[PDB]
């Protein structure tokens, strides 16, 4: 069922989503025993609104693996990219 999808979010001025999870993140509202990074909220009319959705699991960002990544490390990485953030996400279809 699940597929790895690639999307490009243009910071305008930010990505327009929140996340939960990661190593040390004490879980997420979707799959408690998955320690990965999950999108929790997408800003309507924001840069991610046609691309990402709550529940999506981010497993890569601009070539950097998000598998086994810590919670703050993922937040810092996403904050630090200055323009386009090409994401690979896992989504149930």
């Amino acid at each position: 069922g699940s597929m790895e999808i690639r999307v490009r979010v243009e910071k305008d001025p930010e990505l327009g989503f929140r996340i939960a999870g990661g190593v040390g993140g004490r879980g997420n509202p979707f799959r408690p025993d998955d320690d990965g990074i999950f999108v929790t909220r997408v800003q309507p009319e924001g840069p991610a609104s046609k691309l990402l959705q709550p529940g999506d699991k981010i497993i890569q960002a601009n070539g950097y693996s998000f598998i086994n990544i810590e919670h703050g490390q993922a937040i810092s990485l996403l904050k630090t990219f200055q323009n386009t953030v090409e994401l690979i996400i896992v989504r149930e279809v």
Binding site: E14, L15, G16, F17, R18, I19, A20, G21, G24, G25, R26, G27, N28, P29, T40, Q43, H71, I75, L78, K79
Partner: peptide, 7 residues
Amino acid sequence: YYESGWL
């Protein structure tokens, strides 16, 4: 669980 701010 811990949730980030808006990114």
